[PDB]
């Protein structure tokens, strides 16, 4: 490591995002910026890439692709490969698709071939930005020069945003909600989350947009990425899993949102069910006795925090797998909710309702639930937002709730 104190009057998110823009202009490299506990970590460059797909795992280093057959749990396959990366570097970063959480409910055979489950990479360089300092790991000369240039000029002003209409319902979200409700009435499941996609008809600047949104959102984690043809940014509302080096496993389910919240029976029940659900799953991977709800049904939303100690027969990937996908983005019971999503949502979800991850050689894992994000693939730019569906839900109300959820990003999109 090296370091260079943070200039006063400069916000770490803005600076980290600018650095992402700057390094991109000069070196034209892939990156992932992850915000975690006051540290904005820019993982710059891909030294080695792990691609996990439904049919194959690939490790790509220096343009050389090494393909792998895998069977069993996706977590084991991802885990084995990632552990290898972590022999050479301290951290690895990436995203996990929603579809990583399909084998667990037996739904894998429904995936098309070459369906992406995770992309995890070890970076060439790491730059960490906190209010206190800027830390450099394995920064070469262009990277050093790039930081210097940024520090020398300081951040660009964010241009004004360009609006998008989210009123159109091309995917029949209203119709699909109606269908889900009938099934719920019919006892197929209690809850399911469904979503819609709102195309953005103009290109956006991802780093400038991420900065604008960040000012106006307060998330558990945030991310900006340019990774393998995918561009994305997001302020994750929820922590799916964290594993500490000492083996403490944390998960933080949230079933609150829109006093009345703390007393509302519907919200209370919905929450209690997730907490109980998280506990059971965490129980699968936990040292016997260790699992506890340390904060319960506290309003933050309504959130609880569940703790456990990872069992020695178990590992970080298995813990993520056990907790995947999050209830908040699937439904109850989880197997039925997931199956319903396959039928009733536009798949494959990919990054939506998945996780963005940071892993460490010390056994660390940090996984954040991906909602409130924007994406660019191909020439396609879009947003995705969803709602929880229960027997009582009405489609028009649900449509507006997605609208509300999309207003986290809609006012803040900078073009280019
Ligand atoms: C913290 C978080 C889990 C709580 C909420 O947020 C969401 C839940 C499900 C889908 C989305 C979405 O944006 O598509 C979402 O934002 C909530 O409204 O309950």
């Amino acid at each position: 490591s090296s370091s260079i104190p943070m200039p006063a009057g400069v916000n770490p998110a803005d600076l980290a995002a600018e650095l992402a823009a700057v390094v991109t202009e000069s070196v034209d490299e892939d990156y992932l910026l992850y915000e975690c506990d006051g540290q904005w970590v820019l993982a710059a460059g891909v030294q080695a890439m792990v691609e996990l797909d439904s049919d194959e795992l690939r490790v790509i280093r220096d343009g050389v692709t090494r393909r792998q057959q895998w069977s069993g749990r996706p977590g084991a396959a991802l885990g084995e490969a990632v552990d290898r990366l972590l022999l050479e570097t301290d951290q690895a970063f990436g995203w996990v698709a929603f579809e990583f959480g399909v084998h667990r409910y037996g739904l894998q055979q429904r995936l098309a071939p070459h369906t992406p489950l995770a992309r995890v990479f070890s970076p060439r360089t790491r730059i960490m930005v906190s209010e206190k300092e800027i830390r450099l790991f394995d920064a070469g000369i262009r990277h050093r020069e790039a930081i210097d240039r940024l520090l020398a000029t300081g951040v660009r002003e964010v241009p004004q945003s360009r609006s998008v209409d989210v009123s159109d319902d091309p995917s029949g979200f209203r119709r699909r909600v109606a269908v889900a409700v009938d099934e719920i009435a019919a006892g197929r499941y209690h809850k399911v989350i469904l979503s819609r996609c709102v195309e953005v008809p103009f290109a956006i600047d991802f780093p400038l947009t991420y900065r604008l949104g960040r000012r106006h959102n307060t998330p558990v984690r945030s991310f900006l990425l340019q990774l393998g043809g995918i561009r994305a940014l997001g302020y994750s509302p929820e922590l799916v899993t964290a594993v500490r080096a000492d083996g403490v496993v944390i998960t933080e389910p949230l079933a609150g949102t829109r006093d009345d919240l703390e007393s509302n029976s519907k919200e209370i029940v919905e929450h209690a069910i997730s907490v109980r659900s998280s506990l059971e799953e965490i129980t699968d991977i936990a040292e016997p006795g260790s699992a506890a709800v340390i904060d319960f049904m506290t309003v933050r939303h309504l959130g609880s925090t569940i703790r456990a100690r990872l069992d020695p027969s178990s590992d970080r990937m298995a813990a993520l797998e056990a907790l995947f996908p999050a209830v908040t983005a699937s439904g109850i019971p989880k197997a039925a909710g997931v199956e319903a999503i396959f039928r009733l949502d536009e798949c494959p979800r990919g990054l939506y309702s998945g996780a963005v991850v940071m892993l460490s050689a010390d056994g660390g894992l940090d996984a954040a639930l991906t909602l409130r994000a924007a994406y660019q693939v191909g020439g396609r730019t879009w947003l995705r937002a969803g709602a929880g569906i229960i027997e009582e839900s009405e489609p028009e109300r649900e449509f507006e709730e997605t609208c509300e959820k999309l207003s986290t990003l809609t006012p803040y999109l900078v073009a280019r």
Side-chain angles (χ1 to χ4, degrees), residues 215-243:
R215 266 128 81 147
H216 303 288
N217 274 286
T218 58
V220 180
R221 306 283 191 260
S222 84
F223 77 89
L224 170 66
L225 63 85
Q226 204 219 334
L227 200 67
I230 307 183
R231 269 178 191 113
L233 54 94
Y235 329 90
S236 164
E238 166 170 329
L239 180 42
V240 177
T241 174
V243 193

Side-chain angles (χ1 to χ4, degrees), residues 13-15 17-18 155-159 206-216 224 233 235:
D14 300 301
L15 195 85
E18 287 283 295
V155 313
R156 282 168 305 172
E157 293 285 288
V158 177
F206 270 76
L208 283 173
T209 305
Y210 164 88
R211 287 175 61 198
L212 201 40
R214 195 50 196 88
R215 266 128 81 147
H216 303 288
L224 170 66
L233 54 94
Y235 329 90

Side-chain angles (χ1 to χ4, degrees), residues 104-105 277-285 322-324 334:
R104 168 173 179 83
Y105 303 118
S277 173
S278 306
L279 261 180
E280 285 163 5
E281 304 172 329
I282 204 130
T283 279
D284 290 325
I285 58 85
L323 299 160
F324 219 83
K334 233 208 196 70

Side-chain angles (χ1 to χ4, degrees), residues 193 237-238 254 256-257 301 328 352 371-372 384-386 401 405:
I193 281 85
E238 166 170 329
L254 277 37
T257 198
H301 282 107
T328 298
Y352 183 73
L371 304 160
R372 303 129 189 299
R384 203 165 166 161
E401 183 189 334
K405 262 136 161 187

